[PDB]
Amino acid sequence: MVKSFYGYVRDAWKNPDETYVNELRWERLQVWRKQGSVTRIERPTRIDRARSLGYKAKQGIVVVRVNVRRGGLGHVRPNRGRRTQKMGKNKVSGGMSIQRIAEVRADRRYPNLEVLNSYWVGEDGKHKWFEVILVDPHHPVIKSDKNLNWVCDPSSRGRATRGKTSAGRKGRGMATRGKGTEKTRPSIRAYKSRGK
Amino acid sequence: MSHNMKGQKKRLAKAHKQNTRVPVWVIVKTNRKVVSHPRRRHWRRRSLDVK
Amino acid sequence: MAILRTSEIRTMTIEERADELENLNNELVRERALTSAGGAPENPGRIGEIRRTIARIKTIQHELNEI
Amino acid sequence: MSKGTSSMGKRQKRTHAKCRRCGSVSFNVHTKQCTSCGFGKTSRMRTYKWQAKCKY
RNA sequence: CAUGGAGCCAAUGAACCCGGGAUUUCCGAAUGGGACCUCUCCGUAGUGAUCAUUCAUGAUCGGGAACGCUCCGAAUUGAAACAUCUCAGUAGGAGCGGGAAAAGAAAUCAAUUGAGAUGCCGUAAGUAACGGCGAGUGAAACCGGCACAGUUCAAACCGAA
Ligand SMILES: [Mg+2]
Ligand SMILES: [Mg+2]
Ligand SMILES: [Mg+2]
Ligand SMILES: [Mg+2]
Ligand SMILES: [Mg+2]
Ligand SMILES: [Mg+2]
Ligand SMILES: [Mg+2]
Ligand SMILES: [Zn+2]
């Protein structure tokens, strides 16, 4: 088993409760809770995950940690007449996942980049921290980079807000094909939102 | 003596000079087909939408 | 014919262009000053042609990089 | 004193001034927002789908 | 627009139309500070906010008839009442965005053996399915077409090449 060290990082992060990642988790969440909603970091907390998701060690790529509240879409009780099925909102969690929420907040704070992907990095009772990869589509290195130069196209600006990232496509019910995607692909809006 | 700034008095000046009849030669040139415009008004009526 | 053609403005110099602009502004001041009494100009096309001439001279000056 | 013509002579003041961005007399003087174009509240122009009818 | 008086422009080729420039006050994304003041104060002359970077420079901001994508989301009404249902993911809202956008190259659909990305059109079909199994809602595959397109990363091995 001549395995790269990225494999060892992935092994350490496969079951993080029963590895050395638990000690680092207890030491790291103290610093992470104090930080802001969208915090920039030097290196990704899990380098193998970022590299498989598309991170490269070059300028014009930014990695940011985002804190998102745990739980579903907290909603307001309606103050006007509802038919008793559209009146209850405590047991309603929306169609926006927390990963999409974190990606959209990272895209909001960093307007001149694009959200590439993101991955779970840690969590506690009240928060979920996600590390979001962003790309600079106007840096010359990304312009020259042929494996990232698709992002310079006009159709790629606003990926995380048009549901084009991997968490976005998962949330739009496009992880699979065949049966079950009769009302999701090619878009939720195409079938009057009946899928999802 | 309402106390206007410069722009308010400029708007009232334009409103004042809009409130004049069509010239006689315009009526003569147009074969009397242009005899008025909508901006005629009197000060003791509907107030200006100026200030 | 015209007050002064733009080719003649290109023929002129910087000092002569400034002198022509000064004289044209002074004559436009005189023509607009007489109309403050309301009396029509003896040359009613003169005012518009002098303004167009001033525009043409300013265009030539900006083309020649004077200001 | 009445609610009709008696108390309508107190209309010697304003609540809407002529907005800069659109030249309409809709700029509220207390909320600092034009209720026609939304200047003072947003960079974009306020336009809603209920300002016209459903196109079908 | 709109062949009135008096002049002016035009054979140094105007007017007019196409193309390329100049000028383009103040506000407005409005962006040096400020707005019941479309102006005003400081002038040390203005890159306001959020960002990328080699800190040279660069990006986003607003608008656009509808369309596109993402998320949030009623009630009238129908059931001859009405609550599941329907109205309807409609109306409306928030974000993003281009000339198109989304989709997209199987951890697929089939059936005993096959096909070979996606979209859209016809049909399957008011069928399967759902449903106070009430009222109603309601596909896809196969198939016939429009059009045809396949690939790039992570990793193994090398190690600044
Ligand atoms: Mg925030
Ligand atoms: Mg596309
Ligand atoms: Mg509509
Ligand atoms: Mg009924
Ligand atoms: Mg925009
Ligand atoms: Mg795809
Ligand atoms: Mg339905
Ligand atoms: Zn306004």
Swiss-Prot record, chain A:
Signal peptide: none annotated. This is Large ribosomal subunit protein eL15. Residues 153-196 are annotated as: Disordered. It comes from Methanosarcina acetivorans (strain ATCC 35395 / DSM 2834 / JCM 12185 / C2A). Keywords: Ribonucleoprotein, Ribosomal protein. It holds the Pfam family Ribosomal_L15e. GO terms for biological process: cytoplasmic translation. Belongs to the eukaryotic ribosomal protein eL15 family. It comes from the Archaea.
Swiss-Prot record, chain B:
Keywords: Ribonucleoprotein, Ribosomal protein. The keyword Ribonucleoprotein applies. It comes from the Archaea. GO terms for biological process: translation. GO terms for cellular component: cytosolic large ribosomal subunit. InterPro entries: Ribosomal_eL39, Ribosomal_eL39_CS, Ribosomal_eL39_dom_sf. HAMAP family: Ribosomal_eL39. Belongs to the eukaryotic ribosomal protein eL39 family. This is Large ribosomal subunit protein eL39.
From Swiss-Prot, chain C:
Pfam families: Ribosomal_L29. GO terms for molecular function: structural constituent of ribosome. One of its GO terms (cellular component) is ribosome. Keywords: Ribonucleoprotein, Ribosomal protein. SUPFAM superfamilies: Ribosomal protein L29 (L29p). The keyword Translocase does not apply. This is Large ribosomal subunit protein uL29. It comes from Methanosarcina acetivorans (strain ATCC 35395 / DSM 2834 / JCM 12185 / C2A). The gene is rpl29.
Swiss-Prot record, chain D:
Signal peptide: none annotated. Zn(2+) binds at C19, C22, C34, C37. One of its GO terms (molecular function) is structural constituent of ribosome. Pfam families: Ribosomal_L37e. HAMAP family: Ribosomal_eL37. The keyword Zinc-finger applies. Binds 1 zinc ion per subunit. Binds to the 23S rRNA. GO terms for cellular component: ribonucleoprotein complex; ribosome. Belongs to the eukaryotic ribosomal protein eL37 family. It comes from the Archaea. Its cofactor is Zn(2+). The keyword rRNA-binding applies. InterPro entries: Ribosomal_eL37, Ribosomal_eL37/eL43, Ribosomal_eL37_CS, Ribosomal_zn-bd. Keywords: Metal-binding, Ribonucleoprotein, Ribosomal protein, RNA-binding, rRNA-binding, Zinc, Zinc-finger. This is Large ribosomal subunit protein eL37. GO terms for biological process: translation. A zinc finger (C4-type) spans 19-37.
